[PDB]
């Protein structure tokens, strides 16, 4: 399992991501509007990243064979119809400057590799004598996207190309990059060599920058998408996917459970604007999600259009107690599961502990808890973390019981005497 | 899971049980010999219980203790009594009082196993229930039987006089100076046939008997019921597998433990089974051999001890202690290992991947413990990182069994160790000094 | 799996057993009445054994500490209140003589070991200088019966005691012995050493005599009994128990599925006469049972009081086709199972094959079959074995489909052109 | 189970497939080289098919065969065509006709793999459907995609013109002299997303195309979906495991085969996977290594051949044949083994017990066959008795691979053989002479 709140000295990222609200086609004004909202309402709670998802280099996002915006060295650039400030060689620098001025951080998603277009044009590699055709691995592609070919790690110039990307991103004032298409699929092995190359590239780029590569908990046996969305059966399944993830060795990274499909989403997407909506999650479901994401240290990336938040949604995001579980708790662990009743626990740094109790069933259930499950042999005071209220005291000889509505959960703080 | 070292103020029982060496047939001399050994070599390390397993009331037909018309030793109120051929100090009404007195005089504690219910022999004789107005026939549930032993019928908890019967047993045991009672046939023998109301009566009885006394029921994960692995047509006739010196049972215990920890539970220690170590099978018909030294290799023995320690299982030694060698005694007197079983908290399953298994716990002195297990039949490299156990600072790693330093380990590193098949390693992680 | 119709030159036993009808307490007149019925109606079809089940040595069958009938050498004898002809040292000889005169064979069940009573009396062992106390293994008992202790194979005299039993049984004209309490249970290992001793004892006894020792297919996860009875859920489970049995190595014996609880049963039993009844199996269930028992080569032991049979029950027992599957077919095998639809198959010796199709579901289902499942690549004629009727032809390119009522099955003969 | 050696008059396909050596990128010279080898060394033993795997229509961006505005090679009616950089004989309208002609001239047969559906590129271009009044957009089901490959959309079987599209593909393939078509992405990629009506159209199309042609779909048991064993967080992202030279996949195939045989089935051979033998991974990104000799030990290679033989799997060699050594060629030319795969009947699973596995079949010459497998990672003794396979007379036992006599075996005996880990033995049982 993954039982720490810091990995390489960093806590899980907290921010906003353009995908659930704007798909592949977010605009500069949309990004800045979200950054302004975050600066005014959220920043003081630790929300910090403003992240543009994939295909920011595609003017026509949301032919499938339309050209991508690309420099002479085969490096993808922001579409200036969507990012007017990127003109005249500026790229994302003006956007990131604005974000930094708000006290926030700027992130992007990229696809693994080198553009097929670069290979077509045989673009030179910046900082190398080799060209795109000489470094591409043209049999290594993405099972769900046609933008790129892999880079061939056995070729001179291959590392140079990756370095050239992260140097560009550094010049643009990027603070975070997530790389997609690293995971295995039927026809492609996990891209381990490119992972190593990317890691060296970001270390060399000359600017502090967070890298994210890990796909989160693996799938278990429209739904054809691997993406997490506002649908109870996907949220239900995430509970098991997390249990499985935790009992494996390869957990040295945040379990990335997915963007939070909360508030106003579906504005643009690959399948059109028709799906523009408020999250389909009930309030109980939304809290259930927040509780799992918090207690396992998932990054917290808000997926909705922030400026359309209501009081309720803002309140999900501004609970110092919940955020503290996600950012600072340790010994995070799966406690039990029986017949759709689930408990997870963690420990705070000030003598306290946390217990999350979940009813995943479609009918009301009574959830049970004892101090012996979480290592405590003294009387504690129990608090409800979400509403800050005192519940009761609890001794080692006792059991706590709570009836939970379907899909409802409770987050408890266990505080010593 | 179960993450505390104390329940109702007590730690997991440590002791000796007569079953793996002498089966149902231990004698008083054998009990005292083991008690004396424990007193002389083990008491100071926390070993305390001397436990007589089931059928202590069943003399055989060749004994002058045998009445063919009423073959179990039993009092007039339907309470089973010690076989006086095996326990001569029990004669003339003394019961187990002299034996428990001898054990107490060694600074040790005395335990017995009983079978759930009331003897069939009491039902036959229609024995009066002491402190009641009823008889055995009026309280027995004759359709409640134990499929692996004919001694008893269930007691029907819906009947007047049922609680009185159980009260009367625990009064007798208190009289005898008993400190520990384990009830067998108290789990469902066939999964569906549970005994929850009968358990509540036992609990009330022990609580009312006027003597401090530990009650042990059947929380699992041993015995293994309806084992999934290692199945043959002949062995499948045995639905209930008690733990013994066979790798197939030890291997399966690892999965059964993982499953047990994921249950809500009842707040009892997990019982992984008695320790089949040293000289076992002396008079024994249910184990994987005859009169023998344990079939477990040394690696396997440590593997068993490591899992039992890290999950807070009771530690009940099942060998004839007096025949121990230096190796076996050294398994019992390692204070570091015993301290994991007796004192650690936050006891938890960490990972399992292709027969590589990790468990962890935390000490009360700034230290943590990690158990790494190669369950495979060829050598494997086991890995570990600090992020799996909640540590974000550099630590010193020690081999608990041989009390030696291994190396330091930083949060940015992986610990790797090559382990032989069935071999494990118990690590102490202390703060980097 | 077990794919032959002869084991040590013998076919599966066919007969009547006293247990389902009379429990432990059958009488001489009851045994003879069943033998007479068998001689008059069944013998020509191959039904041959007349088998007295356990505790024929107990006068009070149906204290639990009442004495058993026993000779001076610790050998159990027939209760003369139940078996008057056993008087004056005759034992079962007059009964078996009567059975042989009817052209039939006589069998008994015994419990493993030596009587506890013999150990109490320290009875001498016939043909040995040792006594019962010197040969008994008093920690080895039966989990469900208190009559015996095991014999200790490491002791002189132990083999002699077993030999003395089979010599007695030979003198009584016994033709078949089943030994109970050989199988493992929680507290006792499988009794392998005693098995070897018993085998040598029967070889030495001086009379051809069939030994049966094998418990049949093991249990899977009043019902507390291991005995098979007239209850659909037990019959349902037998299908899986047989599948599991077949895929193990230790199959060198008939899979003994249990006595057939057909017709009039429950007359006496351990729990009294109150349960006296006609079989609770429906007609479809009764055929389903017969079909499984036949196709896997289970012994066929009728458990009811034969003299109370109706036309229907007699007809189950006198179908030469079905009996021929049980007695003579080979390559017996599990073909498929999906969602309570099951098929088994076998091959005859005259070019034909057999397919058994079963609906174990509580609702009607359609069962499918193709010639490729059973190794046939030519057109066949299909016959219904039970009613002898012609169904249809079937080519390799086709599928046979049949709707079956719940718990209903069909037995087909596949005959070449 | 599936117990015949002939289905619709044909036996399991034997041939070579370009995937394990060249992935999606085989060239015409590579296909002809393998075809020539097969013709020269293998044809006489029953090897006949030369099969080009998927993406034969996908030139890469560095090729002069590449149009960035329409990157897959495709005709005006939305039918995919050979990449002319890789298949230069395909130029100027020839398609695969010259290649199939060359293959036929060697006395061999020509096969391709296609992806289910219609190219997304056809939908984009709104390509007319040949012999219809409709276009690609009017027949595509754009919500039906393949999760592991972006080439196609599903064809909507509820639409007018859908059958016409499929008809048009099989006319093209008939034109090209194709003898075998395997459709990929035709099973449910995620178990629920099945394609039964689309299958019926494919079947009708191949039947109407005017050329005898074998259709192969996806009957299982390979690829393994949602594998139960050998799971890591990284590898679980791959839901579909194609068979390759890794023991963990071979091991799992044994259980997947047992499960497959217990299904009702559709009356197709079980496909256990292509044979990763000899020189593989030359241009390959989905396998467990790079340019290499097979990672399977010799014992493992025979183990694979034994299971594939005894269950009637197609035999598709996936190595670069021209680089074979004497060992690899000898695996392909053992007439006894091939005769099991091509001629045996009554093919059946016999037992599995603690990683010891037995399968059997019957020959058409009075003989039987038994395959014994040690799937364990240490040596084991495998047993066998005649009663398991329907024989009640004494037999002679032969080792099929090395064509040698072992011993006689009577019905009253057990055959025992010690097998190394992962080692198997294929026995012929003939009548005692």
């Amino acid at each position: 399992g993954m039982e720490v709140n810091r990995l390489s000295a960093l806590t899980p990222p907290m921010g906003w991501n353009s995908w659930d609200c704007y798909g592949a086609s977010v605009t500069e004004e949309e990004v800045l509007g979200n950054a302004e909202y975050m600066a005014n309402h959220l920043k003081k709670y630790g929300w910090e990243y403003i992240v543009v998802d994939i295909q920011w280099y595609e003017p026509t996002a949301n032919n499938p064979f339309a050209p991508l915006c690309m420099d002479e060295y085969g490096r993808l650039l922001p579409a200036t119809n969507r990012f007017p400030s990127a003109k005249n060689g500026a790229g994302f620098k003006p956007l990131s400057d604005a974000i930094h001025d708000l006290g926030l951080k700027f992130g992007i998603h990229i696809m693994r590799g080198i553009p097929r277009q670069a290979v077509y044009e045989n673009s030179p590699v910046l900082g190398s004598t080799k060209t795109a055709r000489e470094i591409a691995h043209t049999n290594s592609i993405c099972p769900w996207n046609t933008d790129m070919y892999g880079v061939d790690p056995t070729k001179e110039g291959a590392q140079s190309y990756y370095n050239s990307l992260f140097e560009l991103y550094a010049q643009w004032g990027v603070d975070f990059v997530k790389v997609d298409d690293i995971a295995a699929s039927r026809l492609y092995d996990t891209h381990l060599e490119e992972i190593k190359m990317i890691q060296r590239a970001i270390q060399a780029c000359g600017r502090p920058m967070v890298l994210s590569l890990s796909p989160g908990p693996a799938p278990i046996k429209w739904r054809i998408t691997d993406d997490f969305w506002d649908d109870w059966s996907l949220l239900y399944q995430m509970f098991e996917r997390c249990e499985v993830w935790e009992k494996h060795i390869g957990t040295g990274h945040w379990p990335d459970c997915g963007m939070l499909p909360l508030g106003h989403i579906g504005i643009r997407s690959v399948d059109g604007p028709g799906g523009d909506r408020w999250t389909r999650f009930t309030k109980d479901e939304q809290l259930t999600m927040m509780n799992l994401w918090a207690i396992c240290h998932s990054p917290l990336m808000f997926g909705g259009e922030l400026r359309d938040n209501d009081e309720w949604t803002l309140s999900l995001l501004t609970n110092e107690g919940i955020l503290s579980i996600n950012q600072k708790s340790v010994l995070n662990r799966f406690v039990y599961r029986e017949e759709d009743k689930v408990a997870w626990a963690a420990n705070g740094r000030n003598g306290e502990a946390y217990v999350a109790l979940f009813n995943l069933h479609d009918q009301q259930k009574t959830l049970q808890f004892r101090l012996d499950m979480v290592g405590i042999m003294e009387t504690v005071q129990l608090f409800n973390v979400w509403d800050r209220s005192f519940l009761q005291s609890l001794a080692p000889s006792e059991s706590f019981q709570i009836e939970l509505k379907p899909h409802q959960s409770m987050m408890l703080k266990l505080s010593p005497d």
Side-chain angles (χ1 to χ4, degrees), chain A residues 1-43 45-62 64-71 73-177 179-195 197-213 215-220 222-236 238-246 248-269 272-279 281-310 312-319 321-327 329-338 340-367 369-377 379-400 402 404 406-417:
Chain A
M2 206 288 307
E3 292 192 2
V4 294
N5 70 299
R6 277 186 207 270
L7 285 172
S8 307
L10 298 174
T11 67
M14 292 174 51
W16 168 86
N17 168 282
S18 65
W19 182 264
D20 283 6
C21 41
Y22 296 115
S25 66
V26 76
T27 69
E28 183 178 297
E29 181 279 330
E30 286 158 356
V31 170
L32 275 175
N34 282 275
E36 294 173 346
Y37 184 104
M38 178 173 298
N40 295 329
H41 297 103
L42 300 182
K43 178 174 65 168
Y45 293 97
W47 294 86
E48 84 181 336
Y49 295 96
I50 293 291
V51 186
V52 174
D53 212 288
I54 61 166
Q55 296 179 136
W56 39 267
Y57 41 83
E58 195 166 280
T60 45
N62 308 341
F65 314 122
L68 305 179
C69 306
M70 193 178 78
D71 75 11
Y73 302 104
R75 307 185 296 184
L76 296 166
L77 311 168
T80 57
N81 64 320
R82 293 162 49 194
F83 301 99
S85 67
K87 77 177 100 54
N88 303 137
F92 274 139
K93 184 55 166 182
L95 185 46
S96 80
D97 279 350
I99 292 160
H100 296 148
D101 286 342
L102 288 168
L104 298 169
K105 296 189 179 312
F106 180 58
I108 64 170
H109 287 214
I110 71 174
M111 297 302 306
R112 179 194 57 110
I114 184 160
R116 303 194 188 174
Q117 182 168 307
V119 173
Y120 177 67
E121 302 185 10
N122 195 27
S123 303
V125 172
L126 182 65
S128 177
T129 63
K130 308 296 162 176
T131 67
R133 295 185 182 182
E134 297 177 306
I135 67 157
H137 200 191
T138 57
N139 55 357
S140 181
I141 59 170
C142 180
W144 51 264
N145 171 274
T146 56
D147 296 341
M148 324 296 273
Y149 294 119
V151 169
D152 187 340
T154 67
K155 299 294 182 54
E156 291 190 305
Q159 179 72 62
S160 290
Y161 177 73
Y162 274 131
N163 292 352
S164 79
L165 295 196
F166 292 81
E167 281 290 355
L168 189 54
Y169 309 146
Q171 284 158 343
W172 293 343
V174 175
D175 310 300
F176 169 100
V177 178
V179 186
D180 290 334
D181 188 38
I182 294 295
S185 58
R186 184 177 178 174
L187 300 191
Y188 318 95
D189 292 349
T190 305
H191 303 294
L192 298 173
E193 292 304 305
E194 282 174 277
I195 286 170
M197 287 195 273
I198 293 172
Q199 288 170 337
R200 300 298 164 120
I202 204 173
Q203 275 172 32
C205 71
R207 175 177 181 86
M209 193 180 307
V210 171
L211 179 67
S212 174
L213 285 179
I220 54 162
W222 74 266
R223 293 185 177 291
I224 207 82
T225 190
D226 284 335
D227 288 332
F228 178 77
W229 281 101
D230 57 321
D231 174 87
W232 174 249
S233 73
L234 299 180
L235 179 50
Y236 177 88
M238 192 63 60
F239 282 82
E240 184 174 4
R241 292 172 70 177
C242 289
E243 295 156 29
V244 171
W245 185 87
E246 297 285 1
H248 290 296
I249 300 175
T251 55
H253 38 266
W254 313 121
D256 192 353
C257 286
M259 316 301 165
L260 306 161
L262 286 175
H264 183 195
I265 53 183
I267 301 160
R268 275 195 310 278
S269 108
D276 186 333
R277 68 188 182 277
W278 197 255
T279 184
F281 282 141
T282 69
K283 285 172 168 184
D284 283 340
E285 290 170 349
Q286 295 175 37
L287 291 163
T288 286
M289 176 176 58
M290 290 302 304
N291 287 330
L292 180 55
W293 272 226
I295 205 132
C296 77
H297 291 303
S298 180
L300 302 173
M301 292 285 142
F302 194 94
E305 167 55 67
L306 284 165
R307 290 167 288 173
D308 289 323
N309 279 352
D310 55 1
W312 163 262
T313 308
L314 179 57
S315 75
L316 292 176
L317 309 179
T318 56
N319 187 296
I322 291 291
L323 297 178
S324 176
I325 295 155
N326 180 263
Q327 295 290 296
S329 70
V330 295
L331 295 163
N332 309 68
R333 63 203 184 275
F334 173 60
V335 174
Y336 71 67
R337 175 159 189 173
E338 281 185 21
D340 279 344
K341 298 171 288 172
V342 189
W344 283 65
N347 291 69
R349 308 315 305 278
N350 287 112
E352 83 284 18
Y354 301 99
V355 181
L357 307 170
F358 303 88
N359 179 18
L360 303 189
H361 215 67
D362 289 349
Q363 286 76 47
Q364 156 185 176
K365 296 262 168 261
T366 299
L367 265 90
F369 163 69
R370 302 176 308 270
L371 290 169
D372 49 66
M373 296 172 184
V374 296
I376 295 166
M377 287 164 289
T379 300
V380 307
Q381 313 302 317
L382 297 182
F383 296 87
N384 183 326
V385 173
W386 277 108
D387 75 354
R388 280 106 181 166
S389 66
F390 171 76
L391 294 178
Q392 72 176 73
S393 65
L394 186 67
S397 46
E398 304 173 79
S399 266
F400 178 81
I402 183 89
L404 293 169
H407 309 185
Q408 193 183 38
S409 60
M410 189 176 255
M411 185 72 87
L412 303 158
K413 176 159 72 179
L414 285 47
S415 189
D417 291 10

